[PDB]
A paper describes a structure:
These structural data also suggested that binding between N3RAM and [name] would be disrupted by phosphorylation at S1672. The binding site for S1672 resides in a small and hydrophobic cavity on [name], suggesting that both the size and the negative charge on the phosphate group are likely to impair the binding of S1672 to [name]. All these regions are conserved in N3ICD, except for the His–Gly motif, where the glycine residue is replaced by the [name]-targeted serine residue. To confirm this, we performed isothermal titration calorimetry (ITC) on mouse [name] with human [name] peptides, using either N3RAM, phosphorylated N3RAMpS1672, or N1RAM (residues 1754–1781), which was used as a positive binding control. Binding between naïve [name] and N3RAM was weaker (Kd = 0.187 μM) as compared with binding between [name] and N1RAM (Kd = 0.022 μM) and, in line with our predictive model, no binding could be detected between [name] and the phosphorylated N3RAMpS1672. In line with this observation, we were unable to produce crystal structures of the phosphorylated human N3RAMpS1672 peptide in complex with [name] (data not shown).
The Notch pathway relies on cell–cell contacts, where membrane-spanning Jagged and Delta-like ligands (DLLs) on signal-sending cells bind to Notch receptors on signal-receiving cells. This induces two sequential receptor cleavages, releasing the Notch intracellular domain (NICD), which translocates to the nucleus and forms a transcriptionally active complex with the Mastermind-like transcriptional coactivator and [name] (C promoter–binding factor 1, Suppressor of Hairless, Lag-1), also known as [name] (recombination signal–binding protein for immunoglobulin kappa J region). The [name] target residue in [name] is in the [name] domain, which is required for canonical Notch signaling activity as it mediates binding with the DNA-binding protein [name].
Numbering used by the authors:
A (entry chain C): 52 to 388, 394 to 473
B (entry chain D): 1668 to 1682
Write the structure that this text describes.
Amino acid sequence: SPPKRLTREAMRNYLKERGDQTVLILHAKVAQKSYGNEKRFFCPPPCVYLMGSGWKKKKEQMERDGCSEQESQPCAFIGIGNSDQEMQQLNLEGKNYCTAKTLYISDSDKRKHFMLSVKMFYGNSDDIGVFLSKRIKVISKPSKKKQSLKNADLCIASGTKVALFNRLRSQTVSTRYLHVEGGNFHASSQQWGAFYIHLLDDDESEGEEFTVRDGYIHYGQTVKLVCSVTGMALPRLIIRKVDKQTALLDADDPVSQLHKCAFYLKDTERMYLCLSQERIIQFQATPCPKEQNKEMINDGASWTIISTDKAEYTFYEGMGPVLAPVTPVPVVESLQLVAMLELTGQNFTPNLRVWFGDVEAETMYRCGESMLCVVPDISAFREGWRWVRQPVQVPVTLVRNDGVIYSTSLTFTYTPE
Amino acid sequence: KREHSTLWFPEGFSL
DNA sequence: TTACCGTGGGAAAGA
DNA sequence: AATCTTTCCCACGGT
């Protein structure tokens, strides 16, 4: 017989308690393909996080229900989605995250784009599900010609996230990523930061507070690198095109995916953002022989630039453990509009119902990206109102027929008049 | 001025 | 030591 | 033909 549907009481318990389980996948937006038997590793390595207080609440529930700490431990595997290619284990023992350092895509896959697939389950074999990353573009190898703004996916827009890495003499073991730890910028061989790259007008002053521009980043423009997590920023920089081991002062073309970059620290005596082991410094460039248009830069001063993305999924076992995986997790991007509310997003299915607080609404499934629902009358929240006397705000939640709750950061407000 | 941050300065070197 | 391996430059093949 | 993209090849300097 079908599993127990979420009750109004169970929903109220959840709305008060809110121990959500979140799955985060931070990865790069492009990937170079591997030919024959070689392995061209995804750099930065994809990172999976188990966020929210729900993981501890699930752990304690399983243990109280008679699980050992080994059985209550969540297990993860990552690989190229929809492929005959092998999955690799992620080590989550004693940490809430793990990077996949040895992922690669073979030429045997003829797709122009793919998604990473994270298969999850508990140590007792209880299935959690399969979480997909955002879409990743396959590249044969970067172009040696200037980038046109027609190929928007190979460009970098102001206000987007990038990773930056440096490699010494083609050695995989030497890979170091710009990262922020303990309030300081450093060059980690194991972790990477996703940094907002903001375009600044040439006349914009130095300061913790700054005005940003819109558009695609070009070499020679002033930029700000801000950690998406810590809010740590480096001084105003000029992004410069690297040719061999020199920075070009005259290049103004659009910055492309996987290009080698130099970060001139604006208004200094040729100081470039540079690494020295795990340390981040500024190192003075040397003038080029017989040429003023270029400067010779230090080994740790060339940085490969790559746009990054994030897939995020939130779920809660509203009526306790279920047979069916919690996946695919619906994500709600926006809300629009007998009064109807339209939901725009991903992974919607016919077994979902939209809830306004503890009130279940008449839901109409269109596709995996669209859902319509009948807004409950204000009577549902204020017993004898007949109309909206005062504004009433209610959370919007997606609920599966087996009781699985998928919260949204979105509310609905009953507006007066 | 609309974006906020915490400034971090790297130490200078020249060989 | 030898063996094996990503990575990036460059050659060859394809559109 | 000429040119840019894709696939193939190889050795540096790492484990």
